[PDB]
Design an enzyme around this catalytic site. Sequence first.
Site, PDB file in Angstrom:
ATOM      1  N   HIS A  91      22.945  -2.536   5.687  1.00 35.07           N
ATOM      2  CA  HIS A  91      23.103  -3.950   5.431  1.00 35.07           C
ATOM      3  C   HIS A  91      24.026  -4.126   4.241  1.00 35.07           C
ATOM      4  CE1 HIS A  91      19.880  -2.664   2.747  1.00 35.07           C
ATOM      5  NE2 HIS A  91      20.446  -3.508   1.897  1.00 35.07           N
ATOM      6  N   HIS A 116      24.779  -0.913   1.828  1.00 37.11           N
ATOM      7  CA  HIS A 116      23.683   0.028   1.618  1.00 37.11           C
ATOM      8  C   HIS A 116      23.338   0.660   2.923  1.00 37.11           C
ATOM      9  CE1 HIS A 116      22.293  -2.350  -2.121  1.00 37.11           C
ATOM     10  NE2 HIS A 116      23.282  -1.516  -2.359  1.00 37.11           N
ATOM     11  N   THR A 195      15.884  -2.928  -3.877  1.00 37.30           N
ATOM     12  CA  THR A 195      16.340  -4.087  -4.630  1.00 37.30           C
ATOM     13  C   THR A 195      15.845  -5.400  -4.067  1.00 37.30           C
ATOM     14  OG1 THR A 195      18.386  -4.350  -3.408  1.00 37.30           O
ATOM     15  CG2 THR A 195      18.440  -2.875  -5.348  1.00 37.30           C
ATOM     16  N   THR A 196      15.057  -5.352  -2.988  1.00 39.76           N
ATOM     17  CA  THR A 196      14.319  -6.520  -2.515  1.00 39.76           C
ATOM     18  C   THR A 196      12.830  -6.207  -2.502  1.00 39.76           C
ATOM     19  OG1 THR A 196      14.536  -5.874  -0.168  1.00 39.76           O
ATOM     20  CG2 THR A 196      16.202  -7.307  -1.059  1.00 39.76           C
TER      21      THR A 196
HETATM   22  C1  LIG Z   1      13.120  -2.069   4.981  1.00 33.69           C
HETATM   23  C2  LIG Z   1      14.257  -1.790   3.977  1.00 33.69           C
HETATM   24  O1  LIG Z   1      15.081  -0.941   4.327  1.00 33.69           O
HETATM   25  N1  LIG Z   1      13.852  -2.445   2.891  1.00 33.69           N
HETATM   26  C3  LIG Z   1      14.803  -2.403   1.927  1.00 33.69           C
HETATM   27  N2  LIG Z   1      14.681  -3.133   0.839  1.00 33.69           N
HETATM   28  N3  LIG Z   1      15.595  -3.026  -0.016  1.00 33.69           N
HETATM   29  C4  LIG Z   1      16.531  -2.181   0.409  1.00 33.69           C
HETATM   30  S1  LIG Z   1      17.930  -1.827  -0.565  1.00 33.69           S
HETATM   31  N4  LIG Z   1      18.560  -3.268  -0.917  1.00 33.69           N
HETATM   32  O2  LIG Z   1      17.348  -1.312  -1.821  1.00 33.69           O
HETATM   33  O3  LIG Z   1      18.688  -0.879   0.269  1.00 33.69           O
HETATM   34  S2  LIG Z   1      16.208  -1.463   1.929  1.00 33.69           S
HETATM   35 ZN   LIG Z   2      20.464  -3.451  -0.106  1.00 38.75          ZN
END
Ligand SMILES: CC(=O)Nc1nnc(S(N)(=O)=O)s1
Ligand SMILES: [Zn+2]
Length: 257
Positions: A91, A116, A195-196
């Site tokens: 993503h 990412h 990061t989420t």
């Molecule tokens: C399900 C998933 O992959 N959750 C994630 N949350 N943050 C991500 S990141 N921005 O750190 O790549 S990936």
């Molecule tokens: Zn990410």
Amino acid sequence: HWGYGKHNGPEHWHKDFPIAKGERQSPVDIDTHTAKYDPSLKPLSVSYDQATSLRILNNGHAFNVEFDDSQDKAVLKGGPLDGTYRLIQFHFHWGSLDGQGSEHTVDKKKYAAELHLVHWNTKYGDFGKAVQQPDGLAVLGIFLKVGSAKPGLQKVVDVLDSIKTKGKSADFTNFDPRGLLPESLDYWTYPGSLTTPPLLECVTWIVLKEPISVSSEQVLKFRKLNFNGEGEPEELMVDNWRPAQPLKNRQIKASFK
Ligand SMILES: CC(=O)Nc1nnc(S(N)(=O)=O)s1
Ligand SMILES: [Zn+2]
């Protein structure tokens, strides 16, 4: 629920996810003069030749391209890693303007977006178990700057109209993620977090030094996506990035001098 707005954005996340104020949060600013060259670091081994993409989904905070991770088809090895990490999804995070959008920064410099590629350590059997372990995930981060178009990204850009709103998905087969990599695989690495939400501290971050270029028209199409579901008031999906967090007791290591 959480998001990137004035009332539910990153500054509020700690109220539901106290680990937001933790000791190994991401992203961070990469200070190039304080990073430590580590000659013991190995080259990255990216084996994406047998990757099987399945689907593209707007999950209300970004769009995810999902892969079949039921076998060792697309894997990341080497670098700072022990063992084999399988690709599960990629993503992006991006901005409302070309001067912002990336999560990581380099000497306080922000890029227009950040890609990412998310991988999980096969020794833990599934992604859900992996996120509970300090070495469970490896995320490869790639910066995007605006310049010339990236041909390998255009297939993604062209399908975005079909997943404009939250919860929409589309079949997305035969996509080759190799077309998103830069020429060089020189990298910085540090231990960090998602990061989420839920912001779990389970990630070995591998951030590539060399950005890829995308065209203004390509990034403009990212900004036409919606945070909202169909039939809800329109909110453009922009600025879905978390600001840099304190480094605290961590050292960033570099694979190059
Ligand atoms: C399900 C998933 O992959 N959750 C994630 N949350 N943050 C991500 S990141 N921005 O750190 O790549 S990936
Ligand atoms: Zn990410």
